[PDB]
Amino acid sequence: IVRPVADFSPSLWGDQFLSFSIKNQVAEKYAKEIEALKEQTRNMLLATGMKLADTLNLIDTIERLGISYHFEKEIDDILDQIYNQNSNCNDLCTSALQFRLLRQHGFNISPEIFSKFQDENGKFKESLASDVLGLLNLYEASHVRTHADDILEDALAFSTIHLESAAPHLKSPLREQVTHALEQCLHKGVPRVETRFFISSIYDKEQSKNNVLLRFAKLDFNLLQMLHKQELAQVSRWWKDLDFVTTLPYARDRVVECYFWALGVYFEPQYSQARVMLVKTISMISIVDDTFDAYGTVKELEAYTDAIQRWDINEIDRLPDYMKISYKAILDLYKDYEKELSSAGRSHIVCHAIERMKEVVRNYNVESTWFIEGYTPPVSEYLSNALATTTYYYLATTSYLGMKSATEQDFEWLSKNPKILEASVIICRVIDDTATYEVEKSRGQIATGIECCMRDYGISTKEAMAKFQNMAETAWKDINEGLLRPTPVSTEFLTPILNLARIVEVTYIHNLDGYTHPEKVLKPHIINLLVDSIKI
Ligand SMILES: O=S(=O)(O)C[C@@H](O)CNC1CCCCC1
Ligand SMILES: [Mg+2]
Ligand SMILES: [Mg+2]
């Protein structure tokens, strides 16, 4: 049996994360001061007689600084009051910010708040083109539209053209903030990534910065960073101990990248168990994916697929030695999950993730069959298989495992492929297909998404890619609509799904394949989030 020649780049990081011993003195000192700062900030939030603009700016700043997770109740109360008071006497900057904050928190504020800034045709008044803070906040708001907000159809184009025009002559750090926003909007960014940028590059350099908030943000970020490093060390040791790097050498060695993805799903300390469980799943399914894509024979993949469906250690017999390796590891991992959720009485929920993994593997095999037969399915058939091979139904399901408040009812909701989940999955599917078309086409994958699209509609590669981009935009509008109250499950269980979509936008930014090539997109984020602390 002739195996393919391995072509995955080695891990970028070596052993540098393998060992992290926390400085307890420093961590304790940080936590003590943060408690004081937190109380000071709580009082800023609860101050009476603040103007609307000031209140919104404060909330926005605390959110961008990445410390809003300390104040979920205070912020929710304040935003609810603003929503219900329904004010109208504002300028563009305040109106756009108000719209964005409320929509992001699920308050369905009417887009009619923008009508006073438009002519008779719903086009934004170009007389506003010299209002940079207005344009910036309009730009950010334009990304949180639903299908009911066609009033705002012009907002992105309008704000973009005039921010571009103004940017080179703007004062710092406003120039840098505008330039950054044009590359990466806030709503679609990974929260810890945007927080790292905002604290260090913008807020630290604002003449009018509040020193209490800045110090709070820096200490909180660096203290949470200590937790993250501890987690990654624990996961790095778990990975090293499995030693796939040598027993399964055809496979990617990307546990640090998997950790970054888990960190994007949630960064808060209370999701520590959830993060570690999630990264282990992302690592393990990555192995499976590599086995289907670039090592296993048709015969081997069949047995593997069947073995996964039956989920029984007695099935190791039918597998080739190398396949035995990952199959036992997978079965052990889920046993570990069950064990880990035992003392909480939440062991029984692990079955939901297992069923989703079975689904992923079934569709990996279908994908293999298509490749082997040279089949190019219609788009509808393509998606019926290829949506699950994003692993995103599986990852969202996994993300709930370590969340202590997640109930069977939450898993029931998720199992029905609700709209917001389907949207996130679609975004991952079409953005990856656009970014990876040319390489996959080179390797003879005639059932890649864009190829299926081209043949089905009889259109060019350019036209197919535009169609796929449209599908992503529709999906983002569906995500935004899915956050609106009343929500079908607690918002806590929607945010991971939102964050999976954000991970897509960030990993494939500028249509780069940051998936297959870690150095291309992800390496600087990992350094900024997990190697370098923020200087105080
Ligand atoms: O190439 S596949 O379609 O098999 C898988 C790919 O689409 C998705 N892989 C990662 C998952 C987590 C980070 C974002 C993308
Ligand atoms: Mg694959
Ligand atoms: Mg691809």
Coordinates of C-alpha atoms and ligand atoms in Angstrom, one line a residue:
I1 CA 0.0 0.0 0.0
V2 CA 1.5 3.3 -1.2
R3 CA 0.7 6.2 1.2
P4 CA 0.7 9.8 0.1
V5 CA 3.8 11.9 0.9
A6 CA 3.1 14.1 4.0
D7 CA 2.9 17.8 3.2
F8 CA 1.7 19.5 6.4
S9 CA 4.0 22.1 7.9
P10 CA 5.4 21.2 11.4
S11 CA 4.1 23.0 14.5
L12 CA 5.3 26.6 14.6
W13 CA 5.6 26.7 18.4
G14 CA 7.8 23.8 19.6
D15 CA 7.7 23.2 23.3
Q16 CA 7.2 26.8 24.4
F17 CA 3.7 26.4 25.8
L18 CA 4.3 23.0 27.3
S19 CA 5.2 24.3 30.7
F20 CA 3.7 27.3 32.4
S21 CA 3.9 27.8 36.2
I22 CA 1.8 30.7 37.4
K23 CA 3.3 33.4 39.6
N24 CA 0.8 33.2 42.5
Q25 CA 2.0 36.4 44.1
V26 CA 1.4 38.4 41.0
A27 CA -1.9 36.7 40.2
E28 CA -3.2 37.4 43.8
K29 CA -2.1 41.0 43.6
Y30 CA -3.8 41.4 40.3
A31 CA -7.0 39.8 41.5
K32 CA -7.1 42.0 44.6
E33 CA -6.7 45.2 42.7
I34 CA -9.2 44.1 40.0
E35 CA -11.8 43.7 42.8
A36 CA -11.3 47.3 43.8
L37 CA -11.3 48.5 40.1
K38 CA -14.4 46.4 39.4
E39 CA -16.3 48.1 42.2
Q40 CA -15.2 51.5 41.0
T41 CA -16.3 50.6 37.4
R42 CA -19.7 49.3 38.7
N43 CA -20.3 52.7 40.3
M44 CA -19.4 54.5 37.1
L45 CA -22.1 52.3 35.4
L46 CA -24.7 53.0 38.1
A47 CA -24.1 56.7 38.2
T48 CA -27.3 58.8 38.1
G49 CA -28.0 61.6 35.7
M50 CA -25.7 60.6 32.8
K51 CA -26.6 61.7 29.3
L52 CA -27.5 59.1 26.7
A53 CA -24.3 59.6 24.7
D54 CA -22.1 59.4 27.7
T55 CA -23.8 56.2 28.9
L56 CA -23.5 54.5 25.5
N57 CA -19.9 55.5 25.2
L58 CA -19.1 54.1 28.6
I59 CA -20.8 50.8 27.9
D60 CA -19.1 50.6 24.5
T61 CA -15.7 51.3 26.0
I62 CA -16.1 48.7 28.8
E63 CA -17.2 46.2 26.1
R64 CA -14.3 46.9 23.8
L65 CA -11.9 46.8 26.8
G66 CA -13.1 43.2 27.3
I67 CA -14.2 43.7 30.9
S68 CA -18.0 43.8 30.2
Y69 CA -18.3 40.1 31.3
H70 CA -18.1 41.5 34.9
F71 CA -21.1 43.7 34.4
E72 CA -23.6 41.6 32.3
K73 CA -26.6 42.5 34.6
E74 CA -25.8 46.3 35.0
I75 CA -25.3 46.7 31.2
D76 CA -28.4 44.7 30.4
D77 CA -30.5 46.8 32.8
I78 CA -29.2 50.0 31.3
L79 CA -29.7 49.0 27.7
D80 CA -33.2 47.7 28.5
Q81 CA -34.0 51.1 29.9
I82 CA -32.7 52.9 26.8
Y83 CA -34.6 50.5 24.5
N84 CA -37.9 51.1 26.3
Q85 CA -37.4 54.9 26.7
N86 CA -37.0 55.0 22.9
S87 CA -35.2 58.3 22.3
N88 CA -35.0 60.0 18.9
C89 CA -33.3 63.4 19.4
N90 CA -29.7 62.2 18.5
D91 CA -26.9 62.8 16.1
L92 CA -25.5 60.1 13.8
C93 CA -22.8 58.9 16.1
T94 CA -25.0 58.4 19.1
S95 CA -27.9 56.9 17.0
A96 CA -25.7 54.3 15.2
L97 CA -24.0 53.3 18.5
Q98 CA -27.4 53.0 20.2
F99 CA -28.6 50.9 17.4
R100 CA -25.6 48.6 17.5
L101 CA -25.4 48.1 21.2
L102 CA -29.1 47.3 21.5
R103 CA -29.2 44.9 18.5
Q104 CA -26.1 43.1 19.7
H105 CA -27.8 42.5 23.1
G106 CA -31.0 41.2 21.4
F107 CA -33.1 44.4 21.7
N108 CA -34.9 44.8 18.4
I109 CA -34.6 48.6 18.1
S110 CA -36.3 49.9 14.9
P111 CA -34.0 50.8 12.0
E112 CA -36.2 53.8 11.5
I113 CA -33.9 55.6 13.9
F114 CA -31.8 56.2 10.8
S115 CA -34.5 57.8 8.6
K116 CA -33.6 61.3 9.7
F117 CA -30.1 60.7 8.2
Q118 CA -31.5 59.7 4.8
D119 CA -33.0 61.5 1.8
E120 CA -36.3 60.5 0.2
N121 CA -34.7 57.4 -1.5
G122 CA -33.3 55.9 1.7
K123 CA -29.8 57.0 0.7
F124 CA -27.7 58.4 3.5
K125 CA -27.3 62.2 3.3
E126 CA -23.9 62.9 1.9
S127 CA -23.7 66.0 4.0
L128 CA -22.8 63.6 6.8
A129 CA -19.7 62.6 4.9
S130 CA -17.5 65.0 7.0
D131 CA -18.7 63.4 10.4
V132 CA -16.0 60.8 11.0
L133 CA -17.2 59.6 14.4
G134 CA -20.7 59.3 12.9
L135 CA -19.4 57.4 9.9
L136 CA -17.4 55.0 12.1
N137 CA -20.3 54.1 14.3
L138 CA -22.5 53.8 11.3
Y139 CA -19.9 51.5 9.7
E140 CA -19.9 49.2 12.8
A141 CA -23.7 49.3 13.0
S142 CA -24.0 48.2 9.4
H143 CA -22.8 44.8 10.3
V144 CA -25.5 43.9 12.7
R145 CA -28.4 44.1 10.2
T146 CA -31.2 41.5 9.8
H147 CA -33.4 40.8 6.8
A148 CA -35.8 43.4 8.2
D149 CA -33.3 46.2 8.0
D150 CA -33.1 47.0 4.2
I151 CA -33.3 50.7 5.3
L152 CA -29.6 50.2 6.1
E153 CA -28.7 48.7 2.7
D154 CA -26.5 51.7 1.8
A155 CA -24.8 52.1 5.2
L156 CA -21.8 49.9 4.6
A157 CA -20.9 51.4 1.2
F158 CA -21.5 55.0 2.3
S159 CA -19.5 54.8 5.5
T160 CA -16.7 52.8 3.9
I161 CA -16.1 55.3 1.0
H162 CA -15.9 58.3 3.3
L163 CA -13.9 56.7 6.1
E164 CA -11.4 55.6 3.4
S165 CA -11.2 59.2 2.1
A166 CA -10.8 60.8 5.6
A167 CA -8.5 58.2 7.2
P168 CA -5.1 59.4 6.0
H169 CA -5.5 62.9 7.7
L170 CA -7.0 61.7 11.0
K171 CA -5.3 62.2 14.3
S172 CA -4.0 59.2 16.2
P173 CA -5.3 56.8 17.6
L174 CA -8.5 57.6 15.7
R175 CA -6.7 57.0 12.4
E176 CA -5.5 53.5 13.5
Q177 CA -9.0 52.7 14.9
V178 CA -10.7 53.6 11.5
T179 CA -8.0 51.8 9.5
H180 CA -8.5 48.7 11.7
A181 CA -12.3 48.8 11.5
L182 CA -12.1 48.9 7.7
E183 CA -10.1 45.7 7.8
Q184 CA -12.0 44.0 10.6
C185 CA -15.4 45.2 11.9
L186 CA -16.1 44.8 15.6
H187 CA -19.2 42.6 15.4
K188 CA -17.5 40.0 13.3
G189 CA -14.2 39.9 15.1
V190 CA -13.0 37.4 17.7
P191 CA -13.6 39.1 21.0
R192 CA -10.2 38.6 22.7
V193 CA -8.5 39.6 19.5
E194 CA -10.4 42.8 19.1
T195 CA -10.0 43.5 22.9
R196 CA -6.2 43.0 22.6
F197 CA -6.1 45.5 19.7
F198 CA -8.4 48.1 21.4
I199 CA -6.5 48.1 24.7
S200 CA -3.0 48.3 23.4
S201 CA -3.3 50.2 20.1
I202 CA -6.2 52.5 20.7
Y203 CA -7.4 53.1 24.3
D204 CA -3.8 53.2 25.8
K205 CA -3.1 56.1 23.3
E206 CA -6.3 58.1 23.7
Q207 CA -5.7 61.5 25.2
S208 CA -9.0 61.3 27.0
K209 CA -8.7 57.7 28.3
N210 CA -10.1 56.9 31.7
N211 CA -7.2 55.6 33.8
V212 CA -9.3 53.4 36.0
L213 CA -10.8 51.6 33.0
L214 CA -7.4 51.3 31.3
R215 CA -5.7 49.8 34.3
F216 CA -8.6 47.4 35.0
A217 CA -8.6 46.2 31.3
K218 CA -4.8 45.6 31.3
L219 CA -4.8 43.7 34.6
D220 CA -7.9 41.7 33.7
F221 CA -6.6 40.7 30.3
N222 CA -3.2 39.7 31.6
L223 CA -4.7 37.8 34.5
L224 CA -7.0 35.9 32.2
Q225 CA -4.0 35.3 30.0
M226 CA -2.4 33.4 32.9
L227 CA -5.4 31.1 33.0
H228 CA -5.3 30.6 29.2
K229 CA -1.6 29.7 29.3
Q230 CA -2.2 27.2 32.1
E231 CA -5.0 25.6 30.1
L232 CA -2.9 25.5 26.9
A233 CA 0.0 23.9 28.9
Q234 CA -2.4 21.3 30.2
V235 CA -3.7 20.6 26.7
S236 CA -0.2 20.6 25.3
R237 CA 0.8 17.9 27.8
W238 CA -2.3 15.9 27.0
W239 CA -1.4 16.1 23.2
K240 CA 2.3 15.3 23.8
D241 CA 1.3 12.2 25.8
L242 CA -0.8 10.9 23.0
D243 CA 2.2 11.3 20.6
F244 CA 0.3 11.4 17.3
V245 CA 3.3 13.5 16.1
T246 CA 5.1 10.2 15.7
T247 CA 2.5 7.3 15.6
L248 CA 0.3 9.2 13.2
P249 CA 2.8 11.3 11.3
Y250 CA 0.5 12.1 8.3
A251 CA -1.6 14.3 10.6
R252 CA -1.4 18.0 11.4
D253 CA 0.3 18.9 14.7
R254 CA -1.9 22.0 15.5
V255 CA -3.0 21.8 19.1
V256 CA -2.1 25.5 19.7
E257 CA -4.3 26.6 16.7
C258 CA -7.1 24.4 18.0
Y259 CA -6.7 26.1 21.4
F260 CA -7.0 29.6 19.7
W261 CA -10.3 28.5 18.2
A262 CA -11.6 27.3 21.5
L263 CA -10.5 30.6 23.1
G264 CA -12.5 32.4 20.4
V265 CA -15.6 30.5 21.4
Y266 CA -15.3 31.7 25.0
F267 CA -12.5 33.4 27.0
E268 CA -14.2 33.8 30.4
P269 CA -12.7 32.0 33.4
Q270 CA -16.0 30.2 34.2
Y271 CA -15.7 28.4 30.8
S272 CA -12.3 26.9 31.6
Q273 CA -13.5 23.3 31.7
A274 CA -15.6 23.9 28.6
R275 CA -12.5 25.3 26.7
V276 CA -10.3 22.4 27.5
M277 CA -13.0 19.9 26.5
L278 CA -13.6 21.7 23.3
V279 CA -10.0 22.0 22.2
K280 CA -9.5 18.2 22.7
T281 CA -12.5 17.6 20.4
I282 CA -11.2 19.9 17.7
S283 CA -7.7 18.2 17.9
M284 CA -9.2 14.7 17.6
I285 CA -11.6 15.4 14.8
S286 CA -8.7 17.1 13.0
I287 CA -6.9 13.7 13.1
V288 CA -10.0 12.0 11.6
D289 CA -10.2 14.6 8.9
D290 CA -6.5 14.1 7.9
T291 CA -7.1 10.3 7.9
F292 CA -9.9 10.7 5.3
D293 CA -8.2 13.4 3.3
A294 CA -4.7 12.2 2.9
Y295 CA -3.9 8.7 4.1
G296 CA -6.7 6.1 4.4
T297 CA -7.7 3.8 1.5
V298 CA -11.3 3.6 0.4
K299 CA -11.6 0.2 2.2
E300 CA -10.0 1.5 5.4
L301 CA -12.2 4.6 5.5
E302 CA -15.3 2.4 5.2
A303 CA -14.3 0.2 8.2
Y304 CA -13.4 3.3 10.2
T305 CA -16.7 4.9 9.4
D306 CA -18.6 1.7 10.4
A307 CA -16.6 1.4 13.5
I308 CA -17.5 5.0 14.5
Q309 CA -21.2 4.3 13.9
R310 CA -21.1 1.3 16.2
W311 CA -19.0 3.0 18.9
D312 CA -17.7 0.0 20.7
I313 CA -14.2 -0.9 21.9
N314 CA -14.9 -4.4 20.7
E315 CA -14.7 -3.0 17.2
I316 CA -10.9 -2.3 17.2
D317 CA -10.3 -5.7 15.5
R318 CA -11.6 -4.6 12.1
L319 CA -9.2 -1.6 11.9
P320 CA -5.6 -1.4 10.6
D321 CA -3.1 -0.8 13.4
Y322 CA -2.8 2.9 12.7
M323 CA -6.5 3.4 12.7
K324 CA -6.8 1.5 16.0
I325 CA -4.7 4.3 17.5
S326 CA -7.2 7.1 16.9
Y327 CA -10.3 5.0 17.4
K328 CA -9.3 4.0 21.0
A329 CA -8.2 7.6 21.6
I330 CA -11.6 8.8 20.5
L331 CA -13.4 6.3 22.7
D332 CA -11.2 7.2 25.7
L333 CA -11.7 10.9 25.2
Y334 CA -15.5 10.6 25.6
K335 CA -15.1 8.2 28.5
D336 CA -12.9 11.0 30.0
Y337 CA -15.7 13.5 29.3
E338 CA -18.3 11.3 31.0
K339 CA -15.9 10.9 34.0
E340 CA -15.2 14.6 34.1
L341 CA -18.9 15.5 34.2
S342 CA -19.8 12.8 36.7
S343 CA -19.7 14.7 40.0
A344 CA -22.0 17.3 38.4
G345 CA -24.5 14.7 37.4
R346 CA -24.2 15.8 33.8
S347 CA -22.6 12.7 32.3
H348 CA -25.6 11.8 30.2
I349 CA -25.2 14.8 27.9
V350 CA -22.1 13.5 26.3
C351 CA -24.2 11.3 23.9
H352 CA -25.3 14.5 22.0
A353 CA -21.7 15.3 20.9
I354 CA -21.0 11.6 20.1
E355 CA -24.0 11.5 17.7
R356 CA -22.7 14.7 16.1
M357 CA -19.3 13.1 15.6
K358 CA -20.9 10.1 14.0
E359 CA -22.6 12.5 11.6
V360 CA -19.3 14.2 10.8
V361 CA -17.6 10.9 10.0
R362 CA -20.5 9.6 7.9
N363 CA -20.2 12.7 5.7
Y364 CA -16.4 12.5 5.5
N365 CA -16.9 9.1 3.9
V366 CA -19.5 10.4 1.5
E367 CA -17.1 13.1 0.5
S368 CA -14.5 10.4 -0.1
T369 CA -16.8 8.4 -2.3
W370 CA -17.6 11.4 -4.4
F371 CA -13.9 12.2 -4.9
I372 CA -13.2 8.6 -5.9
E373 CA -16.1 8.4 -8.4
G374 CA -15.4 11.9 -9.8
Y375 CA -18.9 13.0 -8.9
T376 CA -19.9 16.7 -9.0
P377 CA -23.3 16.9 -7.2
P378 CA -25.8 19.8 -7.6
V379 CA -25.3 22.5 -4.9
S380 CA -28.3 21.3 -2.9
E381 CA -26.9 17.8 -2.6
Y382 CA -23.4 19.2 -2.0
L383 CA -24.6 21.2 0.9
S384 CA -26.6 18.3 2.3
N385 CA -23.3 16.6 2.9
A386 CA -20.7 19.3 3.1
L387 CA -22.4 21.4 5.8
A388 CA -21.6 18.8 8.5
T389 CA -18.0 18.3 7.3
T390 CA -17.3 21.9 8.5
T391 CA -17.6 20.1 11.9
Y392 CA -19.6 23.2 13.1
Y393 CA -22.7 21.3 14.2
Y394 CA -20.3 19.1 16.1
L395 CA -18.2 21.9 17.6
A396 CA -21.2 24.0 18.7
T397 CA -22.6 20.8 20.4
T398 CA -19.2 20.1 22.0
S399 CA -19.0 23.7 23.2
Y400 CA -22.0 23.1 25.5
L401 CA -20.4 20.1 27.3
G402 CA -18.4 22.0 29.8
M403 CA -21.0 24.7 30.3
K404 CA -22.5 24.0 33.7
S405 CA -25.8 25.6 33.1
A406 CA -26.5 23.8 29.8
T407 CA -29.5 21.5 30.2
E408 CA -30.9 18.6 28.1
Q409 CA -33.5 21.1 26.8
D410 CA -30.7 23.2 25.4
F411 CA -29.2 20.1 23.6
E412 CA -32.6 19.2 22.3
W413 CA -33.0 22.7 20.8
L414 CA -29.5 22.4 19.2
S415 CA -30.2 18.9 17.8
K416 CA -33.0 20.3 15.6
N417 CA -30.5 22.4 13.6
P418 CA -32.0 25.8 14.6
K419 CA -31.6 28.7 12.2
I420 CA -28.8 30.5 14.0
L421 CA -26.7 27.3 14.0
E422 CA -27.4 26.5 10.4
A423 CA -26.3 30.0 9.5
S424 CA -23.0 29.7 11.3
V425 CA -22.4 26.3 9.6
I426 CA -23.1 27.9 6.2
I427 CA -20.7 30.7 6.8
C428 CA -17.9 28.3 7.6
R429 CA -18.8 26.2 4.5
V430 CA -19.0 28.9 1.9
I431 CA -16.0 31.0 3.2
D432 CA -13.8 27.9 3.4
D433 CA -14.9 26.8 -0.1
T434 CA -14.1 30.3 -1.5
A435 CA -10.7 30.4 0.1
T436 CA -9.7 26.9 -0.6
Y437 CA -11.2 26.4 -4.1
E438 CA -8.0 26.8 -6.2
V439 CA -5.9 24.4 -4.1
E440 CA -8.6 21.8 -3.8
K441 CA -9.2 22.1 -7.6
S442 CA -5.4 21.5 -8.1
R443 CA -5.7 18.2 -6.1
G444 CA -8.5 17.1 -8.3
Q445 CA -11.4 17.6 -5.9
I446 CA -14.2 18.0 -8.4
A447 CA -16.8 18.0 -5.7
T448 CA -15.6 21.2 -4.0
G449 CA -18.3 23.8 -3.4
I450 CA -17.4 26.3 -6.0
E451 CA -17.0 23.6 -8.6
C452 CA -20.5 22.2 -7.8
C453 CA -21.8 25.8 -7.9
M454 CA -20.2 26.5 -11.3
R455 CA -21.5 23.3 -12.9
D456 CA -25.0 23.5 -11.4
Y457 CA -25.8 27.1 -12.4
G458 CA -23.5 27.1 -15.5
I459 CA -21.5 30.1 -14.2
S460 CA -17.9 31.2 -14.0
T461 CA -15.6 30.8 -10.9
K462 CA -16.0 34.5 -10.2
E463 CA -19.8 34.3 -10.4
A464 CA -19.9 31.2 -8.2
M465 CA -17.8 32.9 -5.6
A466 CA -20.1 35.9 -5.6
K467 CA -23.1 33.6 -5.1
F468 CA -21.3 32.0 -2.1
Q469 CA -20.5 35.5 -0.7
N470 CA -24.2 36.2 -0.9
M471 CA -25.0 33.1 1.1
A472 CA -22.6 34.3 3.8
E473 CA -24.3 37.7 4.0
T474 CA -27.7 36.1 4.2
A475 CA -26.4 33.8 6.9
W476 CA -25.0 36.7 9.0
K477 CA -28.4 38.4 8.8
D478 CA -29.9 35.2 10.1
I479 CA -27.4 35.1 13.0
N480 CA -28.2 38.7 13.9
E481 CA -32.0 37.9 13.8
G482 CA -31.3 34.8 15.9
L483 CA -30.0 36.9 18.8
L484 CA -33.2 38.9 19.1
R485 CA -35.4 38.6 22.2
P486 CA -37.2 36.5 23.2
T487 CA -34.4 33.9 22.5
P488 CA -35.4 30.2 22.2
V489 CA -32.6 29.3 24.7
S490 CA -30.6 31.6 27.0
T491 CA -28.2 34.0 25.2
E492 CA -25.4 32.1 27.0
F493 CA -26.0 29.3 24.5
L494 CA -26.2 31.5 21.4
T495 CA -22.9 33.3 21.9
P496 CA -20.8 30.2 21.2
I497 CA -22.6 29.9 17.8
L498 CA -22.0 33.6 17.1
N499 CA -18.4 33.1 18.1
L500 CA -17.9 30.1 15.7
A501 CA -19.0 32.4 12.9
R502 CA -16.6 35.1 14.0
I503 CA -13.8 32.5 14.1
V504 CA -14.5 31.8 10.4
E505 CA -14.3 35.5 9.4
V506 CA -11.0 35.9 11.3
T507 CA -9.4 32.6 10.2
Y508 CA -10.1 33.3 6.5
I509 CA -9.7 37.1 6.5
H510 CA -9.1 38.7 3.1
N511 CA -10.0 35.2 1.6
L512 CA -6.7 33.9 2.9
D513 CA -6.6 30.2 3.8
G514 CA -5.7 30.6 7.5
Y515 CA -7.0 27.2 8.1
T516 CA -4.3 25.1 6.3
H517 CA -1.6 27.7 6.9
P518 CA -1.2 28.8 10.5
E519 CA 1.6 31.2 9.8
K520 CA -0.6 33.1 7.3
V521 CA -3.3 34.4 9.7
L522 CA -3.3 32.9 13.1
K523 CA 0.3 33.1 14.3
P524 CA 0.2 36.9 15.2
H525 CA -3.1 36.4 17.1
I526 CA -1.6 33.5 19.1
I527 CA 1.4 35.6 20.0
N528 CA -0.8 38.6 21.0
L529 CA -3.2 36.5 23.0
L530 CA -1.0 33.7 24.5
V531 CA 2.6 34.8 24.4
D532 CA 3.0 38.5 25.0
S533 CA 1.3 40.2 28.0
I534 CA 0.0 43.8 27.6
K535 CA 2.6 46.2 28.9
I536 CA 1.5 48.3 31.9
Ligands
LIG1 O1 -12.0 21.6 5.0 S1 -13.2 21.2 5.8 O2 -14.4 21.6 5.1 O3 -13.2 19.7 5.8 C1 -13.1 21.7 7.3 C2 -13.2 23.3 7.3 O4 -14.2 23.7 6.4 C3 -13.4 23.8 8.7 N1 -12.3 23.6 9.6 C4 -12.1 24.7 10.6 C5 -12.9 24.4 11.9 C6 -12.5 25.4 13.0 C7 -11.9 26.6 12.4 C8 -12.6 27.1 11.2 C9 -12.5 26.0 10.1
MG2 MG -10.9 17.2 4.9
MG3 MG -11.9 23.8 1.7

